Amino acid sequence: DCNRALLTRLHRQTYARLYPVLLVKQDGSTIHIRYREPRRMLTMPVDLDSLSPEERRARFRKR
Amino acid sequence: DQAAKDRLKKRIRRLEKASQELIPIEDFITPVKFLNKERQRPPVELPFEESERRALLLKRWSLYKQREHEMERSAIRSLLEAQEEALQELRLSSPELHAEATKRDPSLFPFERQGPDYTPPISDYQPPEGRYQDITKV
Amino acid sequence: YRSKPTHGIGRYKHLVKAQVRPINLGTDYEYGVLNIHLIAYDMALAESYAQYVHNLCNHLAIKVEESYAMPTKTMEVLQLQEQGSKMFLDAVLTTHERVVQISGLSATFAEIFLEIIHSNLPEGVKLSVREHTEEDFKGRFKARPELEELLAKLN
Amino acid sequence: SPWRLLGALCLQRPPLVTKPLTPLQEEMADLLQQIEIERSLYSDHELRALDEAQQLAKKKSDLAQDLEDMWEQKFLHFKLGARLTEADKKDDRTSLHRKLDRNLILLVREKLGDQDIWMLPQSDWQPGETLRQTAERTLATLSENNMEAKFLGNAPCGHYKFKFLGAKVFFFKALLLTGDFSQAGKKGHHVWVSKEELGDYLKPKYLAQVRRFLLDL
Amino acid sequence: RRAAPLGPMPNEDIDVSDLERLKKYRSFDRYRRRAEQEARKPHWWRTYREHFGEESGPKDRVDIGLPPPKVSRTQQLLERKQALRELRANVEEERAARLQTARIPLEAVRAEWERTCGPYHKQRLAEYCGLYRDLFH
Amino acid sequence: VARKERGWGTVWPSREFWHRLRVIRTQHHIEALVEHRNGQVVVSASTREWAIKKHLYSTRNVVACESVGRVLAERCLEAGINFMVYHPTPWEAASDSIKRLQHAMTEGGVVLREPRRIYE
Ligand SMILES: [Mg+2]
Numbered sequence: 001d002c003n004r005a006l007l008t009r010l011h012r013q014t015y016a017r018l019y020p021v022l023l024v025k026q027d028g029s030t031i032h033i034r035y036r037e038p039r040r041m042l043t044m045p046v047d048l049d050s051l052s053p054e055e056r057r058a059r060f061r062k063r
Numbered sequence: 064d065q066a067a068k069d070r071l072k073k074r075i076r077r078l079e080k081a082s083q084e085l086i087p088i089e090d091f092i093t094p095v096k097f098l099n100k101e102r103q104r105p106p107v108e109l110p111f112e113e114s115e116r117r118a119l120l121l122k123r124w125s126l127y128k129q130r131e132h133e134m135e136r137s138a139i140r141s142l143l144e145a146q147e148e149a150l151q152e153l154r155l156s157s158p159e160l161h162a163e164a165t166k167r168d169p170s171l172f173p174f175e176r177q178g179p180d181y182t183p184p185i186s187d188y189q190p191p192e193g194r195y196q197d198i199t200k201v
Numbered sequence: 202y203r204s205k206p207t208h209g210i211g212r213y214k215h216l217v218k219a220q221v222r223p224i225n226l227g228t229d230y231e232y233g234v235l236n237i238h239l240i241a242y243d244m245a246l247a248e249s250y251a252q253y254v255h256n257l258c259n260h261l262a263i264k265v266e267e268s269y270a271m272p273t274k275t276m277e278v279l280q281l282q283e284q285g286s287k288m289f290l291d292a293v294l295t296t297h298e299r300v301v302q303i304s305g306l307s308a309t310f311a312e313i314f315l316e317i318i319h320s321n322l323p324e325g326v327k328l329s330v331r332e333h334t335e336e337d338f339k340g341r342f343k344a345r346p347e348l349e350e351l352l353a354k355l356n
Numbered sequence: 357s358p359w360r361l362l363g364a365l366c367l368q369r370p371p372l373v374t375k376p377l378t379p380l381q382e383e384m385a386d387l388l389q390q391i392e393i394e395r396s397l398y399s400d401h402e403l404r405a406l407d408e409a410q411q412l413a414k415k416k417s418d419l420a421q422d423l424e425d426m427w428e429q430k431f432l433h434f435k436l437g438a439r440l441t442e443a444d445k446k447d448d449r450t451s452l453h454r455k456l457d458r459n460l461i462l463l464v465r466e467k468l469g470d471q472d473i474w475m476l477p478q479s480d481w482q483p484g485e486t487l488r489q490t491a492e493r494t495l496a497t498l499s500e501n502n503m504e505a506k507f508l509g510n511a512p513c514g515h516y517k518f519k520f521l522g523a524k525v526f527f528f529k530a531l532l533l534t535g536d537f538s539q540a541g542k543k544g545h546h547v548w549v550s551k552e553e554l555g556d557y558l559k560p561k562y563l564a565q566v567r568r569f570l571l572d573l
Numbered sequence: 574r575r576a577a578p579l580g581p582m583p584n585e586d587i588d589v590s591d592l593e594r595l596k597k598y599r600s601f602d603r604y605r606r607r608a609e610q611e612a613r614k615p616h617w618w619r620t621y622r623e624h625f626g627e628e629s630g631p632k633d634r635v636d637i638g639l640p641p642p643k644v645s646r647t648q649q650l651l652e653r654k655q656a657l658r659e660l661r662a663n664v665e666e667e668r669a670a671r672l673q674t675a676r677i678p679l680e681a682v683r684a685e686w687e688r689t690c691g692p693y694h695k696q697r698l699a700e701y702c703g704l705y706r707d708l709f710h
Numbered sequence: 711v712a713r714k715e716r717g718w719g720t721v722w723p724s725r726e727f728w729h730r731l732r733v734i735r736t737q738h739h740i741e742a743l744v745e746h747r748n749g750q751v752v753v754s755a756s757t758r759e760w761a762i763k764k765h766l767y768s769t770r771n772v773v774a775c776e777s778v779g780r781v782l783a784e785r786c787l788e789a790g791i792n793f794m795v796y797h798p799t800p801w802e803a804a805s806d807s808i809k810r811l812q813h814a815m816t817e818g819g820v821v822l823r824e825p826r827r828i829y830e
Contacts, residue, residue: 001573002179002374005323007381008249009388014097017396028185028437031325033243037401040431042292045193045280075351086343089273100398117387124384142313145569149515156524163486166510167232167308174330178322179374182437183456193280201344206578207618215589264593312508320571324374656764666767675773677765679784685761698789701752
């Protein structure tokens with residue numbers, strides 16, 4: 001039942017050419033996204049770490 | 064002194080009586096750069112085989128959509144009939160129970176849910192580091 | 202005419218009108234003005250699922266208040282380059298939010314309705330259902346720097 | 357008429373992975389992509405590629421492809437997650453991570469003194485309690501696990517009676533948000549099951565029409 | 574002074590309260606259909622039909638004619654249904670309907686009209702032209 | 711030299727005619743009428759008729775409107791009525807089916823927009 005509203009187009013008059021780019025969040029999941037600049041893969045990066053995770057990120061960057 | 068507070072309260076009243084006009088929506092407005100990228104876009108002569116395949120596929124899609132809407136409406140009707148005979152059964156069971164169960168709970172107020180994705184989340188995966196800078200115009 | 206039995210045969214203004222709190226009563230709990238937010242990075246999925254939600258409301262006879270759109274939130278993807286402590290530009294990620302403003306339902310039809318919504322969520326759509334507060338109404342409106350300047354001069 | 361008091365719960369697992377397209381939706385997706393290309397007003401990547409092409413043609417008469425190769429290479433280097441966590445194990449109906457496409461429901465197995473039941477999880481409440489909190493304490497107690505599950509609301513959904521004296525049963529419906537099941541190899545037989553092999557497994561007349569208010573999807 | 578109406582008001586059936594729940598027509602064509610349906614009913618007030626020559630209104634028409642042909646309704650319906658299914662079975666019918674290029678044999682249409690409903694149509698032309706009025710009243 | 715019913719104007723359509731073409735486009739069938747000012751129907755061509763119904767395909771089409779127009783034009787020539795007034799709605803005037811139905815009426819030989827009254 002997740003396939004109901006997926007089958008659609010852009011209904012506007014003037015619009016650029018879009019591409020089915022696969023995006024990943026801070027996890028293993030992928031989502032199909034109409035996005036320009038026809039790269040096949042797009043990734044989202046880790047932000048700000050945490051108070052006890054900034055030191056772990058610094059240690060991972062050092063190692 | 065007090066005259067400063069008088070002209071101040073005059074200012075809050077005067078800029079309060081102005082309009083609360085909305086932000087424009089970017090998506091409803093065609094951008095300016097989209098004008099001159101049309102001269103090298105030629106029309107495509109659509110062949111008859113492609114046109115008839117598109118048309119018959121549209122007829123099959125319309126029939127399938129009508130049938131799928133019909134079974135979704137049948138499912139919601141079955142759920143509603145079950146819930147009708149259900150509330151009748153509980154009302155015949157106990158008065159205090161339908162006094163309690165006709166509520167919408169305050170825990171429903173932050174109802175948030177995320178749609179399913181293409182691939183499942185994998186374990187032991189480390190995406191790289193980065194930052195986000197908000198360029199949304201205010 | 203007044204004295205005739207055919208008086209008021211031309212009466213029409215009582216049939217067409219042309220000139221919000223939740224009502225919590227204890228037995229019939231009709232709850233008022235809610236916003237259903239549909240958040241996606243893709244134009245087609247956001248607009249089509251807003252269309253599907255609005256058409257489902259029209260079929261299920263909810264008096265819909267509005268069907269509107271939030272302004273776009275443009276996130277920027279700056280990533281850390283390999284072998285360096287450098288930032289490079291990767292993606293311009295636009296976030297679009299299509300919101301359906303519904304007036305009133307019941308609790309029963311809230312289980313039915315939200316069950317159909319998260320059964321029918323497409324790929325890459327974040328669902329949110331909340332009430333109508335002051336902040337959700339102020340979200341479509343621009344900043345008020347002159348009013349914050351006046352309030353800061355007050356304080 | 358004496359009444360015997362039983363709640364019950366319907367613990368719905370949401371799908372994680374979208375289902376594959378039927379062939380009619382696949383060919384409609386092809387049509388929709390074709391008409392998006394037909395109505396598309398080019399792109400900044402294709403404009404640059406055409407401009408570089410015509411300037412190199414004019415220079416030889418008198419890069420976008422590198423980016424294409426790099427993007428395809430970084431796509432081919434990346435391996436995606438496995439869509440099929442079902443067929444690689446092919447035996448376990450017990451695990452929470454069993455099926456990703458369909459909706460899943462929980463059953464547990466108990467042997468009674470006078471009955472042998474294959475049962476959706478149920479309850480028992482003293483009359484001072486409310487059935488919503490009864491379902492919450494049942495979920496917190498009987499499965500000995502940390503299931504952060506969002507209940508839908510106060511209104512019940514499943515409603516069946518069997519009379520000996522009568523005995524009365526009220527199924528609720530509640531959706532899982534996040535889960536943590538301790539002691540995965542416990543002796544209590546719990547199964548996460550979908551609608552078709554649910555219909556295969558469930559014998560009773562009272563539990564035969566749980567599919568009436570379970571969504572088919 | 575107020576008097577009592579002799580019969581029902583036209584718009585008293587629908588509820589004044591809760592206007593949002595009542596379904597609306599949004600089509601002027603739907604209003605045209607509804608108004609032309611409403612104008613043909615015998616209202617109790619003074620009407621155009623009463624004053625402008627409806628030719629006695631309801632008239633008990635004495636029929637001096639041949640019996641209608643007795644045709645089996647179920648057999649007629651099933652043969653019409655089977656002919657329709659064999660007509661929609663073709664693909665070239667779909668092609669001719671879509672591409673706006675299809676013709677009908679008007680001579681065969683005229684023949685089947687003369688067999689089927691031509692009697693009733695000629696009866697209403699004779700009624701309109703007053704053939705019955707000046708011959709058989 | 712007969713009396714037309716001049717007047718009205720606040721209502722629509724104008725009732726100043728001897729014969730009027732009435733096209734009812736139902737979601738299934740297409741039904742055209744030639745109506746006198748009395749309200750009686752003179753000649754009608756509908757796709758509810760079995761005589762047309764076994765001859766056309768897909769009762770709703772523009773081609774169905776063409777069949778209706780040609781059949782009613784032939785029936786009007788058979789009934790001796792050659793003039794009528796057609797008053798379409800401005801969104802029905804731009805439609806494909808009504809325009810080519812008027813084309814079929816013109817090619818059929820029925821001239822729309824009735825002649826002016828003598829000493830009106
Ligand atoms: Mg019959």
